[PDB]
């Protein structure tokens, strides 16, 4: 028509008729995730071993170097680099990039930029369909959690080596070293997040049971119960008064939601608020505000010290403090 080249282009990005919606976050999400995906696969398979700690003992992380799926990892950037922006072109040779912890910092910068914008297009499509916009808020609870383990925690420590590796056994070392230095289990933000998922799983097992247990009889018994629902129907597929009536007898009548719109808000609000504190937990633990510490706290008269369980957890932490980075510490404090 009389439309420009640009208007032809903007009526394609914001077109909802596409199989996967792009939108304007997706024009910079899609080339960042396909960057970060395609480099994650290669370094998980063919990365040469990385000096993680700067002491020139390279750690293996590739499947081609005698690892399996569980011990495979993408090894973090070396301790000598620290927080210096280390792209591919600052290295002289390409193998100097790989040995120093190259593809960790390439992935994380494209990953975190990708998931900030995957949250963006969850808003953007919801504006293109007339939906209410707050699904993008609920995706910020993992985005707050993933920003902390990759970016907010290496800032407070000063190096990308202390961030979390991209591996299954790589994660498990990061959980151990963290609690040895910061005692995460004795921090009320990790206590909220633990209740965020034990409550979150309970509120899914309980809600999903009662909707299944109040289904209306529409099929036979040889046919599955999922055939009673036909897609896009108007009438309700389960009795709601019967499930409040059941759950009202179960504990007491005031302990239930009869308003199903107030119910589904509670299912959204409980884990999302819970993950927000355990995302802010290690965000504050990144700036060295560890947790509780009740060592040598219960004492009697005559100046003696009684053990508690907190002194037992001390012995676990003290056994891991003196073992992580085994050839690094030249000095009797772990300030770094």
């Amino acid at each position: 028509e009389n439309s420009s080249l640009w208007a032809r282009f903007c009526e394609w990005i914001t077109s909802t008729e596409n199989r996967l919606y792009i939108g304007w976050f997706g024009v910079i999400m899609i080339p960042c995730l396909l960057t970060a995906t395609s480099v994650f696969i290669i370094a998980f398979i063919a990365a040469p071993p990385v000096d993680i700690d700067g002491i020139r003992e390279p750690v293996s992380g590739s499947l081609l170097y005698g690892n399996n799926i569980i011990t495979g990892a993408v090894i973090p950037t070396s301790n000598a680099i620290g927080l210096h922006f280390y792209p591919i072109w600052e290295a002289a040779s390409l193998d100097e990039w790989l040995y120093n912890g190259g593809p960790y910092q390439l992935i994380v910068c494209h990953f975190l930029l990708g998931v900030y914008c995957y949250m963006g297009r969850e808003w953007e499509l919801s504006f293109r369909l007339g939906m209410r916009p707050w699904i993008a808020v609920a995706y910020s609870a993992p985005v707050a959690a993933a920003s902390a383990v990759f970016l907010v925690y290496p800032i407070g420590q000063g190096s990308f080596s202390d961030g979390m590796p991209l591996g299954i056994s790589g994660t498990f070392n990061f959980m151990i070293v963290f609690q040895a230095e910061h005692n995460i289990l004795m921090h009320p933000f990790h206590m909220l997040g633990v209740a965020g998922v034990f409550g979150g799983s309970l509120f899914s097992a309980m809600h999903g049971s009662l909707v299944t247990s109040s289904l209306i009889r529409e099929t036979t018994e040889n046919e599955s119960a999922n055939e009673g629902y036909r897609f896009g129907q108007e009438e309700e597929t389960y009795n709601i008064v019967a499930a409040h009536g059941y759950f009202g007898r179960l504990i007491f009548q005031y302990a239930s939601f009869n308003n199903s719109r107030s119910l589904h808000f509670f299912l959204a609000a409980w884990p999302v608020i819970g993950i927000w504190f355990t995302a802010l937990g290690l965000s504050t633990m990144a700036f060295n505000l560890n947790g509780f510490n009740f060592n040598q706290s219960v004492v009697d008269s005559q100046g003696r010290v009684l053990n508690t369980w907190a002194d037992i957890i001390n012995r676990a932490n003290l056994g891991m403090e003196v073992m992580h980075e085994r050839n690094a510490h030249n000095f009797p404090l772990d300030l770094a």
């Binding site: 009740f294 040598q296 706290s297 219960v298 004492v299």
Partner: protein, 35 residues
């Protein structure tokens, strides 16, 4: 009823948050005070 409910919960809710402050006060003094 006789007494309004709103100053029932205020008096009880003050004496509950007044009660919690003792247990924080008792955390730095007395037993378990680490001294």
């Amino acid at each position: 009823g006789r007494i309004p409910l709103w100053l029932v919960g205020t008096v009880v809710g003050t004496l509950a948050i007044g009660l919690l402050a003792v247990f924080f006060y008792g955390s730095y003094v007395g037993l378990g005070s680490s001294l």
